[PDB]
Design a binder for this molecule. Structure first.
Ligand SMILES: *[C@@H]1O[C@H](CO)[C@@H](O[C@@H]2O[C@H](CO)[C@@H](O[C@@H]3O[C@H](CO)[C@@H](O)[C@H](O[C@H]4O[C@H](CO)[C@@H](O)[C@H](O)[C@@H]4O)[C@@H]3O)[C@H](O)[C@H]2NC(C)=O)[C@H](O)[C@H]1NC(C)=O
Ligand SMILES: *[C@@H]1O[C@H](CO)[C@@H](O)[C@H](O)[C@H]1NC(C)=O
Ligand SMILES: *[C@@H]1O[C@H](CO)[C@@H](O)[C@H](O)[C@H]1NC(C)=O
Ligand SMILES: *[C@@H]1O[C@H](CO)[C@@H](O)[C@H](O)[C@H]1NC(C)=O
Ligand SMILES: *[C@@H]1O[C@H](CO)[C@@H](O)[C@H](O)[C@H]1NC(C)=O
Ligand SMILES: *[C@@H]1O[C@H](CO)[C@@H](O)[C@H](O)[C@H]1NC(C)=O
Lengths: 582, 156, 485, 293
């Protein structure tokens, strides 16, 4: 062999219980002896008549396997020693069966690890002389905490009480478990069913039929169904549905997830794992809401005046589904006349003579059909000032919020039944690409809080109309949410002198220069040689205004002209300059 | 040819002896304790010599090329076969005994075992265990070196 | 007077020695060392001037028995003798200094010296170190663990000399031998090198787009002690420079290490120059030099094509087949977003980085090898204005002031295109009467902000208009100004 | 305490101050029995009476030439060495170890069965040497090699020059083998004028062999600044070169190994240099052969 320098011997055995002591005897062939003990191949331990046979007692062997080398430095021999324990009696013994067609498997807890190769056996016994047995080897690599028995006894014969036993063997000492018992009526875990489909009926998204195919012995079933709005899943129970069920009170045109679980007996068997989640598309439904339609009155001429058609849908209850068609109807109330058109967009323009009353209606035609014809009686765009309310005050505590408060008019508030509030932007001329944006507020409510379709540092125009069937009130004012100082001021373009009055004309300063609502202008003029405070004239801003008069100055003396554009939060710096000698 | 397979065998044996030196360093695997498995049909170390290195002449196959046919070198090929037979037998024994216990610190990579197997196809037709593997490797390294030498000289 | 302090001992394993010091003149001294014992048996050695007689083991000397040594010195007609000494000679051992090159390692206020000694036993160790201008200072090394030995020293700011010595300390913690001699000097350099102002010469790049840098040969001197030669403790081992180009980063990092004092060809780019010095520990420190970029005077043609989801620029490159690098830097902003490419035209997709209304610097470099800085050629770094330049080119605050009875002066603030070189070309001012019978144009250089209109007829209403012109597109007119006189 | 050769004895002394020496008996090789004179060359005067003189040795004063004498005719003599021993380990101060802490460096050029063994002496005052194969078994491998010669190489260790003695030895076997199982073991017998030293070594001649540098190196100039470097197998190396083969390291002035006799490389501004190692073992490599670009 290889230990040609003698031999080594152990007492009692290379396998020992935990914490014991071992006698190691080295013998040399007839005609210093050191011991090397290595913990997981790491040197942590170290040290002629007596050398012919040297005996040592070794204690405090650590948890694991270690090597003793008896070296005379030239080696003689050695022995590999291991320490371990008897296996713990196993606990929490359970068993599993899968449906009508499925064998029996079992699981158990082995407890502590012995750091040594052990094995387990699993005995099944039962009446009418049935028995089976299989083993499993658990070692440093493979762990046996579950096993399959491989026999599929009949699940229909559920009148037997069977016995499960698990036993553990190792080199040191055997161990057993409780002679566990199990009722066969509840050992079977059913497999999830198949062919779970959804059929749509009754032409309404609330009504559906759900089908599946499973064993006909199943008595209890549960269904999980929910949309993607929330992670919560709507559960429903059923007893003896026999493969089919009907579902009512469902949200229409909402994608749904569908899952199913089964149960063979109310007091026997066990539940079933959920099947694959099914994605189902719920068909459309006809909306029953009412959408407001907004209009404008621009007077091209007395007999060819322009009427705008505006609406906006933003909720999945009035424009639910694949909506494509819009049948618009304009009716005259005083005389029996109507005009029809088909539109695909949210805006339209029409030319009507001014004579006669108006009623504007539009439909919401999805694939299912057309919704209720949304119609609004129309009065003149701006009516009498008697019902016109007082000055609406706008306060902006946020860059994207305006609170508007309108006082009740001098006329009683009993006549007005509804208030309409509309905001738009401003242009040097006329605007039609950008739609005005609207909202409705009842007169009983005090104020209106708008926080949508609004951008700070742009001057907007708000208008409020008291809606009455005879003659509603009308008012309007300009405002912005947040404004800063303008970057600069516009130009003094044209200067003229006529009828002892000096006229200054300018152009429209562009949009980014304002950075909000421009509120007024301040024109400063002085003499060329005058270094004192220049004298000032104040102009209140009007959008249509582009010229300003000023009184006669000192003749034959030159004058210097400039101006600034002043808002509430800031002032534009000085722009261009003008010199004029009258 | 057997030459490229022999180079593969040398490379994988060098890799294995590197792994054995790294792992079984505490074991006696450094010094040499040089003793080989074979002693009777040791004609590997006496016949596997070139032509012009014979000074005293007294002391079928597929990888013997027709250009270098000889009535001597067939004995060298046969001795190589028998030595490979003994080496593979006791290496199969040591590999089988290596897994009956729970020590998995050294694992014979099957590269050299399949190299020996293909070479056989081409040519013809406790604690004692680690020490026996170590001395088997310490002789097999020089044996595969000799086989590479004689294959390179013969085939080329 | 005479001989004094006799001391014999053993040096190495098989050799011995003796030494003694004389008091008095050494003009005609002769020394004899008498050694003797009983097993009476006596022996004499003669040396004359030298005082280092050796008697190894087979010279008939006893080294395992008590012997008596004494010294007689012979002067003229007189003899004088020193004290007797009685001792063994086998264990009174003189140990060698740490033989071989002793390794020095550096750290923050730390100099660790490691050495190997032949005898594995540990021994007492002392050191003595000298500053470049002062005398020596002493210091113990203290206990150590042993094979090899280690010792410490606080690292001073400049270079210094240091020497080591040992003694075989007896097991009972007593001096068991004579003092060893000092080892060869170890000279250690300054821990941080005080860099001196080296010189560079600036050169504008030529017509081909090449500037030349030739570093001068200069180096300071470090004051060192007497024995500091042949080692890096006296002067630094080598000087070097590191050139880095922070202009075309589109490829991988390419920084070049160059020996100091040689010709180098450099581009019109921003460069980082590091001057470093490799001492016996490593690279000491850095001298920083920043090279700003310059541009060739020769304006070169470039064509662009932007719009939609497609962007390209075309020109006439010198030669295809070699990799180029293109880089975009909008000069007007703080250059927050970095955009360059490594590829005659290049095609890429439009992104909101090159579509704004600020001036862009387009820099084109021709490259041949990503390992050296010489093969990067300055094709062109030009200035461009993207987007609709006509809107931005409109002048603001046009002011007209009457000068005489037939002439006026038109002045205006410079447009956005004025501050951007290479794009603004011309100012066109149109003066036209309102009746349509007179139209005239005046041309103004971009460096002038004013113009004078002469020959204007009196009592006729005039409208004037101003725009700005570039090399590719005209500009829109300003706000018209009306005047009469 | 033993007899080294005819009429010369070597004894051992415990080289430690407080221990006593050995006692030996010397007989005059003469049948005549009477009172006789004994004298040495380390001391004057008669030291021993009678033919059998018992003398104790504990120091180098006690050893040397011992002559039994009477009248004007020299009867006989014997020679007495010593052997230093400290703490149970013999003291070796005649030879100086190499950089590798070993004493004898043996090196072979090829597989012919020949080598040379070099050692580093420390002085030259009357050194005598001997090489022999300390073989126990009849099957132990035997060398048949002779006299040692001084070599003019003065090699510097620890900034001091030591002299390399060399010997040119040749192993022999009655008929060759393919590999070597028993190592060559060699015993050295150093001797400085009284002092005696035994040294040993053991080695296979496959882990010491040192090839020779390549003999015929050329550098063929190629396009794109590439170059063809060529060498040859040294002629001192064994035959054939198919059964015994080498492995050349190539570097340009990190190196790359090849097994052909030509290589494609490119220069950098210095030299290109190759080595010649044995392809199987880590047997020590040759010295470089170079051409300057
Ligand atoms: C190199 O040096 C070593 C010393 O370190 C040396 O070992 C010594 O060898 C000699 C001879 O081989 C030993 O002397 C022998 O001692 C034994 C017992 O002590 C005796 O039995 C021997 O008796 C021989 O001589 C007798 C008288 O001639 C005969 O009658 C008898 O039959 C024997 O032939 C002999 O005295 C010596 O003890 C050792 N030293 C030790 C062990 O410390 C070694 O041999 C040298 N050579 C080599 C190649 O190594
Ligand atoms: C070891 O031997 C001693 C005496 O020989 C004995 O008392 C002891 O029980 C032994 N221990 C074992 C583990 O056998
Ligand atoms: C368990 O081990 C004990 C130990 O002697 C033995 O007596 C018993 O028969 C064993 N039982 C089984 C079932 O293995
Ligand atoms: C040396 O050894 C002798 C042996 O007797 C001893 O007396 C002496 O103290 C030792 N030391 C010195 C320094 O001599
Ligand atoms: C000392 O010897 C060791 C060998 O273990 C070597 O690694 C080291 O480089 C040597 N030199 C020193 C520590 O200066
Ligand atoms: C630039 O703006 C002017 C003024 O609006 C316009 O006439 C011209 O077409 C614009 N050009 C481009 C390329 O957008």
């Amino acid at each position: 062999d290889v230990c040609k320098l003698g031999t080594v011997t152990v007492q009692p055995a290379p396998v020992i219980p935990l914490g014991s002591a071992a006698n190691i005897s080295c013998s040399l062939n007839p005609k210093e002896l050191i011991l090397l003990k290595f913990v997981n191949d790491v040197l942590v331990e170290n040290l002629d008549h007596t050398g012919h046979s040297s005996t040592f007692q070794v204690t405090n062997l650590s948890l694991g396997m270690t090597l003793f080398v008896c070296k005379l430095p030239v080696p003689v021999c050695g022995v590999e020693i291991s320490v371990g324990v008897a296996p713990e009696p196993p606990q929490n013994i359970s068993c599993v069966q899968e449906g009508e067609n499925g064998t029996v498997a079992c699981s158990w807890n082995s407890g502590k690890v012995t750091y040594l190769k052990t094995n387990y056996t699993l005995q099944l016994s039962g009446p009418n002389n049935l028995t089976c047995q299989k083993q499993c080897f658990s070692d440093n690599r493979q762990n046996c905490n579950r096993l399959d028995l491989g026999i599929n006894l009949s699940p229909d014969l559920a009148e037997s009480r069977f016995i499960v036993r698990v036993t553990a063997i190792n080199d040191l000492g055997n161990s057993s478990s409780l002679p566990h018992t199990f009722t066969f009526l509840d050992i079977v875990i059913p497999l999830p069913p198949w062919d779970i489909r959804i059929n749509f009926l009754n032409a309404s998204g609330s009504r559906g039929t759900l089908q599946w195919e499973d064993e006909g012995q199943v008595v209890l079933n549960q269904l999980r169904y929910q949309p993607l709005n929330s992670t919560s899943w709507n559960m429903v129970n059923a007893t003896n549905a026999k493969g089919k069920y009907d579902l009512r009170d469902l949200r229409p045109f909402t994608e749904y997830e569908f899952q199913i679980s089964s149960k063979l007996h109310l007091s026997g068997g066990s539940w079933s794992n959920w099947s694959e989640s099914l994605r189902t598309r719920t068909p459309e439904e006809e909306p029953v809401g009412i959408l407001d339609i907004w209009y404008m009155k621009q007077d091209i001429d007395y007999d060819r005046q322009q009427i705008s058609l505006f609406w906006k849908s933003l909720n999945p209850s009035e424009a639910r589904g694949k909506i494509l068609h819009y049948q618009v109807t304009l009716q005259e109330v005083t005389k029996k006349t109507t005009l029809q058109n088909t539109t695909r967009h949210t805006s339209w323009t029409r030319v009507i003579p001014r004579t006669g009353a108006w009623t504007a209606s539009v439909s919401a035609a999805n694939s299912k059909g057309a919704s209720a014809p949304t119609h609004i009686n129309i009065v003149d765009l701006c009516g009498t000032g008697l019902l016109a309310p007082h000055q609406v005050s706008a306060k902006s505590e946020n860059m994207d919020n305006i609170l508007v408060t309108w006082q009740p008019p001098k006329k009683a508030d009993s006549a007005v039944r509804e208030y309409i509030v509309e905001w738009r932007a401003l242009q040097p001329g006329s605007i039609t690409k950008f739609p005005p944006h609207w909202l409705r507020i009842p007169p009983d409510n005090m104020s209106a809080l708008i926080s949508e379709n609004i951008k700070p540092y742009i001057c907007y125009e708000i208008r409020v109309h008291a809606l009455s069937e005879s003659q509603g009130g009308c008012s309007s004012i300009r405002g912005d949410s947040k404004h800063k100082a303008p970057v600069s001021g516009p130009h003094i373009t044209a200067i003229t002198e006529k009828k002892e009055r000096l006229f200054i004309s300018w152009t429209h300063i562009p949009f980014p220069e304002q950075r909000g609502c421009i509120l007024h202008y301040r024109i400063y003029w002085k003499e060329r040689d005058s270094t004192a405070q220049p004298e000032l004239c104040e102009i209140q801003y009007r959008r249509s205004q582009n010229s300003h008069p000023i009184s006669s100055l000192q003749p034959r003396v030159t004058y210097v002209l400039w101006m600034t554009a002043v808002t509430a939060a800031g002032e534009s710096p000085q722009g261009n300059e003008r010199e004029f000698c009258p | 040819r057997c030459l490229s397979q022999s180079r593969n065998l040398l490379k994988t044996t060098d890799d294995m002896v590197k792994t054995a030196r790294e792992k079984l360093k505490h074991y006696s695997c450094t010094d040499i304790d040089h003793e080989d498995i074979t002693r009777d049909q040791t004609s590997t170390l006496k016949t596997c010599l070139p032509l012009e290195l014979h000074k005293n002449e007294s002391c079928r196959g597929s990888c013997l090329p027709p250009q270098k046919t000889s009535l001597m070198m067939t004995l060298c090929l046969g001795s190589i076969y028998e030595d490979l037979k003994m080496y593979q037998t006791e290496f199969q024994a040591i590999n089988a005994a290596l897994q009956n216990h729970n020590h998995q610190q050294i694992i014979l990579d099957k590269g050299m075992l399949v190299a020996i197997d293909e070479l056989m196809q081409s040519l013809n037709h406790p604690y004692r265990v680690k020490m026996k593997l170590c001395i088997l490797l310490h002789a097999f390294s020089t044996r595969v070196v000799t086989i590479n030498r004689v294959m390179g000289y013969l085939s080329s | 007077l005479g001989p004094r302090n006799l001391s014999c001992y053993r040096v190495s394993k098989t050799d011995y020695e003796c030494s003694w010091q004389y008091d008095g003149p050494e003009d005609n001294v002769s020394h004899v060392l008498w050694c003797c014992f009983v097993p009476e048996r006596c022996r004499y050695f003669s040396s004359g001037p030298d005082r280092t007689v050796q008697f190894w083991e087979q010279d008939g000397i006893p080294v395992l028995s008590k012997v008596n040594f004494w010294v007689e010195s012979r002067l003229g007609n007189r003899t004088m003798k020193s004290q007797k000494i009685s001792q063994y000679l086998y264990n009174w051992t003189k140990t060698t200094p740490p033989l071989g090159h002793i390794k020095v390692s550096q750290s923050h206020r730390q100099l660790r010296m490691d050495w190997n000694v032949s005898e594995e036993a540990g021994a007492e160790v002392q050191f003595r170190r000298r500053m470049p201008t002062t005398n020596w200072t002493l210091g113990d090394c203290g206990p150590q663990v042993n094979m090899s030995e280690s010792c410490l020293c606080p690292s001073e700011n400049m270079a210094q000399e240091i020497q080591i010595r040992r003694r075989r300390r007896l097991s009972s913690g007593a001096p068991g031998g004579p003092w060893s001699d000092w080892s060869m000097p170890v000279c250690v350099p300054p821990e941080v090198l005080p860099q001196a102002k080296i010189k560079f010469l600036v050169e504008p790049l030529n017509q081909g787009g090449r500037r030349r840098l030739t570093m001068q040969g200069q180096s300071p001197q470090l004051a060192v002690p007497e024995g500091c030669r042949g080692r890096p403790g006296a002067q630094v081992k080598k000087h070097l420079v590191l050139v880095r180009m922070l202009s075309c980063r589109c490829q991988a990092q390419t920084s070049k290490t160059v020996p100091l004092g040689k010709k180098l060809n450099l581009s019109g780019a921003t460069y980082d120059l590091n001057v470093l010095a490799k001492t016996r520990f490593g690279r000491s420190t850095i001298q920083k030099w920043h090279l700003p970029a310059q541009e060739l005077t020769e304006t070169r043609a470039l064509n662009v094509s932007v719009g939609g989801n497609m962007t390209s620029m075309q020109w006439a490159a010198q030669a295809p087949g070699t990799t180029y690098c293109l880089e975009w830097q909008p000069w007007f902003q703080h250059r927050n977003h970095t955009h360059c490419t490594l590829i005659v035209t290049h095609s890429w997709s439009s992104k909101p980085t090159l579509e704004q209304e600020e001036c862009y610097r387009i820099t084109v470099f021709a490259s041949k090898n990503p390992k050296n800085p010489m093969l990067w050629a300055t094709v062109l770094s030009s200035y461009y204005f993207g987007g609709n330049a006509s809107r931005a080119g409109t002048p603001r605050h046009v002011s007209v002031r009457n000068q005489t009875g037939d002439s006026v002066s038109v002045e205006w603030t410079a447009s956005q295109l004025s501050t951007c070189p290479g794009v603004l070309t011309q100012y066109v001012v149109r003066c036209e009467a309102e009746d349509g019978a007179w139209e005239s144009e005046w041309l103004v250089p971009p460096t002038k902000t004013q113009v004078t209109l002469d020959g204007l007829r009196s009592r006729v209403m005039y409208k004037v208009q101003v725009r700005a012109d570039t090399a590719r597109l005209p500009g829109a007119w300003s706000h018209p100004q009306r005047f009469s006189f | 305490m033993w007899e080294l050769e005819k009429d010369v004895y070597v004894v051992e002394v415990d080289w430690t101050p407080d221990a006593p020496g050995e006692t030996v008996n010397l007989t005059c090789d003469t049948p005549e029995e009477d009172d006789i004179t004994w004298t040495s060359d380390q001391r004057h005067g008669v030291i021993g009476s009678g033919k059998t003189l018992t003398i104790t040795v504990k120091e180098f004063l006690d050893a040397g030439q011992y002559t039994c004498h009477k009248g004007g005719e020299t009867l006989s003599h014997s020679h007495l060495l010593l052997h230093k021993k400290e703490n149970g380990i013999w003291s070796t101060e005649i030879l100086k170890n190499f950089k590798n802490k070993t004493f004898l460096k043996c090196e072979a050029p090829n597989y012919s069965g020949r080598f040379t063994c070099s050692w580093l002496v420390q002085r030259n005052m009357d050194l005598k040497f001997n090489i022999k194969s300390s073989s126990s078994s009849p099957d132990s491998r035997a060398v048949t090699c002779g006299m040692a010669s001084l070599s003019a190489e003065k090699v510097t260790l620890d900034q001091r020059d030591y002299e390399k003695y060399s010997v040119s030895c040749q192993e022999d076997v009655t008929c060759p083998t393919a590999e070597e199982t028993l190592p060559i073991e060699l015993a050295l017998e150093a001797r400085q004028q009284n002092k005696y030293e035994n040294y040993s070594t053991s080695f296979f001649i496959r882990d010491i062999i040192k090839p020779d540098p390549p003999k015929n190196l050329q550098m063929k100039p190629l396009k794109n600044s590439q170059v063809e470097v060529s060498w040859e197998y040294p002629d001192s190396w064994s035959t054939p070169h198919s059964y015994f083969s080498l492995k050349f390291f190539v570097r340009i002035q990190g190196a790359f190994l090849v097994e052909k006799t030509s290589t494609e490389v490119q220069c950098k501004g210095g030299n290109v240099c190759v080595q010649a190692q044995d392809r199987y073992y880590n047997s020590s490599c040759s010295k470089w052969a170079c051409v300057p670009c």
